[PDB]
């Protein structure tokens, strides 16, 4: 019959939002025809047309019967107050995973409690090895999602409104009117169709937890919420590529920059080599402005575009550089993420190279070596990635040179040792860190790195690249030939 | 057909934030039609938006701008007293830097004489002549324009990346914007598309009309 | 006849970390952003420097609908009814509302940091046994000169006389909201670039650029000079003065050069006593 | 009127380890950054000197809100609602306890060395042959004249008669927090170039240049004698005082130089006298 609601992806004045919000129209009713495949069972005798880009809608009867079936199914609380949405299947998702969805729904969509009442908090200890962390959240009993449809149509007539709805935040993140003098005018304006996208937008986007590496995730419990929202280029694709996402652990959820949930949201997709890999998506990063901020602000968006190049490069870091270390404390599972995977992340975002300062962040700043034993986990990662940089080459091959100086080195001291004794390598190469962290200026650090360079004795590698090891020494600074001297020190495996 | 007029911009900073984007002042990658009018009207000292409605305009970005934040003190209508706190609030805003485009204007749609792209041509010929207030600028108020300049299809002899109207494109562009709240705002799909020519393709034409 | 006066203007050499933005927890970050050639440069809001103007025509009578109370710092408003014919900030920066607006009669860019930005911070752990929270804090500053860019269409002024004050005020730059406590960074220009012209176009908006990190020489910049060797431009309404005549003096073939024939004065306020008489009489003041 | 009071100090030659960063592994860095020539130099704090001139005052008698209890190594209020026109140190340097705040008369920027950075250290290890993880120690250390720029608005004090006490803090400014057990840097003055003016522009910030990149010469920097000669600044604002006043009058030409008009005297405190007495007449004090 003729469509009262008519959708399709390729209409101009839609947004992204927009975009996301029919996925979510598209799942939802894929997830209904599931639980009732009959006519008769949909209320309001409602009918769906699904294709690859559009959404098509047919029903019986007055309007608002029908949108009200429709948005009771869609949206739904279950006994433990977590929010139930239909889109995602939430069978083979666990409770940690639904109150995590719902912590962060409620956090970004209903930050204000004009449009939803909270029940009593509920606690429950789940148990992970041998110890029950108490889950502690807010449960819900009705929010502005389920009860939309009165807003939707006409209060007289029981119909879709023929003219713009003045729509809010909670429909639209971002939507907030600037001048609250002005409020029953300056309101974002929207058609039924579109509100009904803005409506069912928040069962696509995921949400992750990201801490700050500055603070202490110790003395510092994880509260800003990214919000990752897809760029869309097929209804299937997208339920696809979310349905997939659903299957990972809420420890990966929790990262350390916006890149890296972002790319974490792309981490399942399937990597296809005659097709052209190319996805986008929004980060929606959501904070208190301040310690006594009563709902989250949005502080940041940001666009990321992953090439088939950055992915798999993403899934070579994942694999080489170690997990998060899922800490577990009195009701505290903290989670350890390693800053070099995000740094690696954001410059292959950048598109400028992983290695753009990663000892930097390694020892210089990270003292504690927080990151720096990630480095000690990951240091052979560190070198394949610098060996993938070509201009590395230069450097590798002084750290060849170096290596080959301290075999010399360490064969004289084997020489110079007695019968019986054992010889202090260790005592020795922590010693040559001291001398090496010692030098204070250029001069110095010369000196003693051309005279452990000669007591070392016949070199192949200077041999061979004389001048061109020659002239790194000349022109590089004093600094970088120590920390990458430090490096060969390190890496030295016989 | 009278060869299209051509200027050439440049301008050191500007901000075109999308629409719905009320929460923070994020923008679009591209000067939106809407924006580019207004502007072109600023430039020929047209306070009446409707004089000029039907000109066809298309945008060839010759360098593509970084985004970056910058946080702001905005001020905002939501006390009756001034000097309430609730008035200031801190609030992050994106801007373009370094923002090289070329613009293209076809009036030959306009049904008043004379057009848009003839009151552009005369105000550069003669500058005294041309009566008008402000200083121009692009996006906000402060965003000042650094050069703008009659240019032909030559002025870099490079590489364009134009805007093409996309009903699969990523950019939703307006071409006439609704300042009170989002009635009368109409939208477009717009698209980057990295092509080598001197002329815009047709779609690039964006032609601004009244909402109704 | 429609009148205009851009500006491209330079400070001086020093410590500053004038803005600043939204901290985490430690550190108060300068906000930056990208600039030629990509790298990235500290920034100084616009709105910073008009709010140093109003505060500087506030603090040399010049009557202010929008006073600053110092000992409150807040914003009072004295006439809800703006009247640019009277008040000089509703004539200068306009006002808006719910008659209905103006808009300002200046506008100026952000201003930016000559050479790009270098991790660089201060530590701030403050003096006492007791070492409670609230210590050690981290202030990212910059050693570098800002310059920024302005323009105002004279026309536009209620009051043709009000051209004046800001060009003392922009001269005599009091203060751009900044840790004046850590880093007193003073804002009154080194070198300038003015052009009073008829045209709405000045090409002058970015000329000085050195890059060449952590350095002072701040050379103008050669698209500058090929802009106004064009033939494009125009000399003659050309002002430059400050520190950046020395080296335009020092240059080559100076004497012979389109430049030469541009109003080029060291001392800045012989280049003031200058343009304001030529302003002056082309206003009829 | 409006009267301000800005002024460049440069400090004696001697080894200063002032400022030290936070230390990595066992060496104690003192923190450093790049400045002119883009060679690293090292900086001393402007809340170091702030706090030296807050105990300048808290020891001369003066109220002084906060008192330093030097036994205990603690800081006390006297009031927990502060009154800065009662209390020196509210009146000048300012409060935020977070009325509630003050914006604070005296501004002041970071002490960079003159010269750069060699990266000279020094090696402390405790005596004994029992030896544990403590035992050895490296700390950097500068052989440096330090030099600092300040800004302070006559007008912005609570009472006008307390520019009187910073400035003798100045010029007896006690020790500035560092390593005095092993590098003792006094931060006495001993040359300065102040200058005393209404208008607020100010072409003295950091004033001074080595001859030398290793040496103890400390001349006088090309700009600021260019300035002067070329017509701003003026002579009769200026005050030039301290071991740099030898080079000024051994330079050639200097009884025609507009140097020459301007208030120099070889003893600092005489300059500073005459300065004061310049204030007292100025501020009707």
């Known amino acids: 019959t003729q469509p009262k609601i008519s959708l399709s992806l390729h209409a101009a004045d839609t947004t992204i939002m927009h975009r996301v919000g029919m996925t979510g129209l598209y799942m939802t009713l894929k997830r209904l025809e599931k639980q009732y495949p009959l006519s008769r069972q949909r209320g309001g005798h409602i009918s769906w047309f699904l294709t690859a880009d559009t959404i098509e809608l047919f029903w019986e009867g007055s309007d608002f019967i029908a949108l009200s079936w429709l948005i009771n199914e869609s949206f739904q609380l279950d006994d433990t107050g977590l929010i139930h949405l239909v889109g995602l299947d939430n069978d083979r998702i666990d409770l940690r995973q639904k109150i995590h969805i719902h912590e962060g729904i409620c956090g970004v969509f209903l930050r204000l409690n004009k449009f939803y009442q909270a029940g009593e908090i509920i606690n429950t200890e789940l148990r992970f090895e041998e110890k029950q962390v108490e889950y502690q959240y807010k449960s819900l009993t009705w929010y502005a999602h389920q009860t939309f449809a009165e807003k939707l149509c006409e209060a007289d007539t029981q119909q879709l409104r023929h003219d713009y709805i003045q729509i809010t935040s909670w429909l639209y993140l971002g939507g907030i009117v600037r001048h609250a003098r002005t409020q029953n005018t300056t309101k974002l304006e929207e058609k039924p169709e579109y509100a009904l996208a803005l409506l069912f937008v928040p069962v696509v986007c995921h949400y992750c937890l990201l801490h700050i590496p500055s603070e202490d995730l110790k003395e510092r419990k994880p509260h800003r919420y990214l919000v990752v929202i897809p760029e869309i280029k097929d209804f299937e694709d997208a339920s696809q590529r979310r349905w997939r996402l659903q299957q990972l652990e809420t420890k990966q959820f929790h990262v350390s920059s916006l890149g890296e949930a972002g790319l974490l949201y792309y981490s399942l997709d399937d990597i296809q080599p005659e097709v052209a890999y190319y996805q986008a998506c929004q980060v929606w990063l959501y904070e208190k402005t301040n310690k006594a901020s009563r709902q989250r602000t949005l502080m940041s968006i940001e666009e990321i575009k992953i090439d088939k190049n950055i992915l798999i490069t993403y899934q070579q870091v994942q694999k080489y550089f170690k997990t998060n270390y899922q800490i577990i404390k009195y009701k505290q599972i903290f989670i350890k993420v390693n800053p070099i995977r995000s740094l690696i992340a954001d410059n292959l975002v950048k598109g400028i190279h992983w290695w753009s300062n990663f000892w930097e962040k390694l020892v210089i700043e990270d003292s504690k070596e927080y990151l720096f034993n990630q480095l000690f986990s990951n240091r052979e990662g560190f070198i394949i990635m610098a060996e993938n940089s070509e201009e590395d080459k230069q450097y590798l091959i002084f750290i060849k040179v170096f290596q080959q100086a301290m075999k010399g080195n360490f064969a004289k001291i084997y020489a110079k040792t007695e019968e019986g004794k054992d010889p202090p390598i260790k005592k020795k190469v922590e010693r040559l860190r001291a001398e090496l962290n010692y030098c204070y200026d250029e001069l110095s650090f010369k000196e003693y790195l051309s005279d452990f360079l000669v007591r070392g004795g016949l070199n192949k590698y200077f041999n061979e690249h004389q001048e061109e090891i020659a002239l790194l020494i000349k022109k590089s600074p004093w600094q970088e030939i120590r920390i990458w001297s430090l490096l060969a020190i390190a890496s030295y495996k016989p | 057909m009278i060869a299209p007029l051509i200027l050439y911009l440049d301008v050191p900073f500007t901000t075109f934030r999308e629409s719905h984007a009320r929460e923070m002042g994020k923008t679009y990658p591209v000067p939106p039609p809407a924006t580019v009018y207004g502007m072109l009207l600023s430039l020929v000292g047209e306070t009446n938006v409707y004089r000029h409605c039907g000109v066809e305009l298309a945008i060839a970005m010759l360098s593509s701008p970084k985004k970056s934040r910058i946080l702001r003190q905005m001020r905002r209508f939501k006390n009756a007293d001034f000097s309430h706190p609730e008035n200031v609030i801190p609030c992050y805003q994106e801007i373009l830097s370094n923002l090289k485009c070329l613009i293209w204007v076809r009036s030959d749609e306009e049904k008043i004489q004379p057009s848009l792209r003839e009151r552009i041509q005369l105000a550069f010929d003669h500058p005294e002549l041309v009566r008008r207030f402000g200083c121009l600028f692009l996006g906000e108020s402060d965003q000042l324009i650094k050069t703008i300049k009659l240019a032909r299809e030559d002025y870099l002899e490079g590489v364009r990346q134009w805007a093409i109207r996309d009903n699969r494109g990523r950019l939703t562009l307006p071409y006439w914007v609704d300042h009170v709240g989002s009635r009368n705002t109409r939208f477009l799909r717009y698209r980057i598309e990295e092509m080598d020519r001197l002329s815009p393709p047709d779609l690039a034409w964006t032609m601004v009309q009244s909402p109704i | ?285």
């Open chain 3, 1 to 285: 006849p429609n009148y205009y006066l851009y500006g491209t203007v330079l400070t001086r050499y020093g410590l500053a970390s004038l803005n600043h933005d939204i901290r985490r927890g430690n550190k108060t970050i300068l906000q930056k952003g990208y600039w030629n050639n990509g790298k990235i440069h500290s920034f100084v809001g616009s709105s910073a420097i008009r709010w140093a103007l109003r505060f500087y025509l506030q603090k040399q009578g010049y009557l202010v609908n929008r006073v600053w109370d110092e000992e409150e710092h807040i914003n009072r408003l004295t006439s809800e009814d703006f009247d640019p014919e009277k008040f000089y900030d509703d004539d200068i920066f306009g006002f808006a509302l719910l008659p209905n607006q103006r808009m300002g009669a200046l506008g100026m860019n952000m201003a930016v940091s000559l050479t790009p930005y270098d991790g660089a911070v201060k530590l701030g752990a403050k003096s006492g046994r007791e070492k409670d929270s609230t210590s050690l804090h981290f202030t990212e500053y910059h050693a570098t000169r800002y310059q920024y860019y302005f323009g105002i269409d004279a026309t536009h002024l209620k009051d043709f006389s009000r051209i004046l004050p800001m060009i003392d005020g922009i001269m005599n730059l009091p203060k751009v909201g900044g840790s004046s406590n850590i880093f007193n960074y003073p804002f009154c220009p080194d070198s300038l670039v003015f052009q009073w012209t008829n045209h709405f176009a000045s090409y002058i908006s970015y000329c000085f650029e050195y890059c060449d990190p952590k350095s002072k020489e701040a050379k103008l910049s050669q698209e500058f000079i090929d802009e106004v060797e064009c033939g494009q431009i125009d000399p003659s309404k050309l002002w430059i003065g400050g520190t950046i005549v020395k080296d335009l003096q020092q240059l080559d073939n100076f004497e012979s050069s389109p430049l030469n024939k541009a109003h080029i004065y060291r001392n800045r306020n012989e280049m003031i006593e200058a343009l304001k008489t030529v302003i002056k009489r082309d206003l009829g003041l």
